[PDB]
């Protein structure tokens, strides 16, 4: 019943109380605010909006996403806050415990908490079937002419057609992935940094969504 937003920074390691080694991920979560409260009487479902990283103010001839535009300023003016560039909703929390316009701190999570993490996987581009779907090669010798072509998705002749959901080359990576049942190792109050035991989906400087485990 708690959640934050942050940026993945990298991977390192720390030592345990018994002297064992655990791999951890450094996550930076700062400038989290509450922007809106959706309720069943109005929206039909209870949730809260959270902004992560603050932008720059309005500009007359802005050309990039560095500066907020006019419609985004009105949304960030209802709750007194600077405009944010990452905005996500959290349905797992209880709305009445939150108030519009307050900071969300890393102190909400304590050490030993069981969490699940959501992110967007790294992109690999247009890939073949050996790497995309993990199927086997053909012989590399003995007169063979079958090395890296798709070799586990053959079809019969009665149907005179190909079925849906075949596994042939395409674009791989860039999907939404969740890793469940991770654990909080240590929280840092000065740097707004959380250490998560394990690894999380995504590249460097990517956005990550941290919640409490549902099961």
């Amino acid at each position: 019943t708690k959640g934050i937003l942050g940026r993945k920074i990298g991977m390192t390691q720390v030592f345990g109380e018994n002297g064992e080694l655990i791999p951890v991920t450094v996550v930076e979560a700062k400038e989290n605010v509450v922007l809106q409260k959706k309720t069943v009487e109005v929206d039909g479902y209870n949730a809260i909006q959270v902004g992560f990283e603050d932008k720059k103010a309005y500009k007359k001839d802005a050309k990039s996403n560095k500066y907020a535009n006019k419609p985004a300023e009105g949304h960030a003016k209802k709750a007194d806050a600077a405009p944010k560039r990452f905005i996500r909703e959290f349905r797992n929390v209880d709305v009445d415990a939150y108030e519009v316009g307050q900071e969300v701190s890393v102190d909400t999570f304590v050490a030993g908490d069981v969490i699940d993490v959501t992110g967007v996987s790294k992109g690999k581009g247009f890939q073949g079937a050996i790497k995309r779907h993990g199927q086997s090669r053909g012989p590399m010798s003995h007169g063979s002419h079958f090395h890296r072509a798709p070799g586990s998705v053959r079809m019969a002749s009665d149907a005179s057609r190909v079925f849906k959901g075949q596994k042939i080359p395409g674009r791989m990576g860039g999907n939404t992935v969740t890793v469940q049942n991770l654990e909080v190792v240590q929280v840092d109050t000065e740097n707004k940094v959380i250490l998560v035991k394990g690894n999380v989906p995504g590249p460097k400087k990517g956005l990550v969504e941290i919640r409490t485990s549902i099961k």
Binding site: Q13, G19, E20, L21
Partner: protein, 121 residues
């Protein structure tokens, strides 16, 4: 032990000198064994005088590997050859001597007898 045709040296006091892996026990489809695993093997080279003869299918346990093993504190140990010890059914060596250093992970209540005879653990 790594495969179905890996040849192992024998580091005990018996007639067997080298063996050949025939099977890796402990599950359907398993195809790799490490230090502390039991394998089914056959004897390819032996010595004149001993209980073990050529062409016998026996069981053995793994004590040394070139690929080593990883501890849960971030340390590794890697040996210089692959070696094994022939054992009876009740986890007991059928020889009376053991040569060479022995991996430290063989004491978990299972192979205490073999660890006792080892010159260096």
């Amino acid at each position: 032990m790594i495969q179905q045709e890996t040849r192992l040296k024998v580091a005990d006091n018996s007639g067997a000198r080298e063996v050949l892996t025939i099977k890796v026990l402990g599950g359907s489809g398993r195809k790799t064994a490490n230090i502390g695993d039991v394998i089914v093997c056959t004897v390819k080279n032996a010595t004149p005088g001993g209980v073990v003869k050529k062409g016998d299918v026996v069981k053995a346990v793994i004590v040394r590997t070139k690929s080593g093993v990883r501890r849960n504190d971030g340390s590794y140990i890697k040996f210089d050859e692959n070696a094994c010890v022939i054992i009876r059914d009740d986890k007991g060596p059928r020889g009376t001597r053991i040569f060479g250093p022995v991996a430290r992970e063989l004491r978990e209540g299972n192979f205490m007898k073999i660890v006792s005879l080892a010159p260096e653990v």
